[PDB]
Amino acid sequence: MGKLSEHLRYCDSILREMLSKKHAAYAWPFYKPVDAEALELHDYHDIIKHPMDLSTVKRKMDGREYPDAQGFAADVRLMFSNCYKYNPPDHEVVAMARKLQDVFEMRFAKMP
Ligand SMILES: CC(=O)NCCCCCCNC(C)=O
């Protein structure tokens, strides 16, 4: 695969930070697709029409599917939005999403 553009090399760095040990205490719920059968979330796919998670963002980045930084960011925000949408606002996983999202939004805004 071709080299990523400058902006996307920075985005790849954000992705690797979001998957790193540093943020694992709150990032782990986003590592893989929500397994609705395994978790018995019978209504998950009724409510969330476009699932997203970090392994999928990685698959897409490694496959050069993002045309620009905005495309990457849309997927990342979709991942957080799905979490806020599906779950009750007081669930632990919502607080974990928000902690991770604080990291994302700060790193993304400082993109050179
Ligand atoms: C996923 C897990 O292994 N344990 C319990 C956490 C449930 C989280 C609800 C579904 N996940 C998201 C990201 O909305």
Swiss-Prot record:
Disulfide bonds: none annotated. Residues 2-111 form the Bromo domain. It comes from the Eukaryota. Ubiquitous. There is a cross-link at K110 (Glycyl lysine isopeptide (Lys-Gly) (interchain with G-Cter in SUMO2)). It is found in: Nucleus; Chromosome. The Bromo domains specifically recognize and bind acetylated histones. The NET domain recognizes and binds the 'KIKL' motif found in chromatin proteins. Chromatin reader that recognizes and binds acetylated histones, thereby controlling gene expression and remodeling chromatin structures. Recruits transcription factors and coactivators to target gene sites, and activates RNA polymerase II machinery for transcriptional elongation. In vitro, binds acetylated lysine residues on the N-terminus of histone H2A, H2B, H3 and H4. Interacts (via bromo domain 1) with GATA1 acetylated at 'Lys-312' and 'Lys-315'. Interacts (via bromo domain 1) with GATA2 acetylated on lysine residues. Interacts (via NET domain) with CHD4 (via KIKL motif). Interacts (via NET domain) with SMARCA4 (via KIKL motif). Interacts (via NET domain) with NSD3 (via KIKL motif). (Microbial infection) Interacts with the Integrase protein of Moloney murine leukemia virus (MLV). It is linked to A chromosomal aberration involving BRD3 is found in a rare, aggressive, and lethal carcinoma arising in midline organs of young people. Translocation t(15;9)(q14;q34) with NUTM1 which produces a BRD3-NUTM1 fusion protein. Belongs to the BET family. This is Bromodomain-containing protein 3. It comes from Homo sapiens (Human). The gene is BRD3. The chain holds residues 306 to 416 of 726 of the full protein.
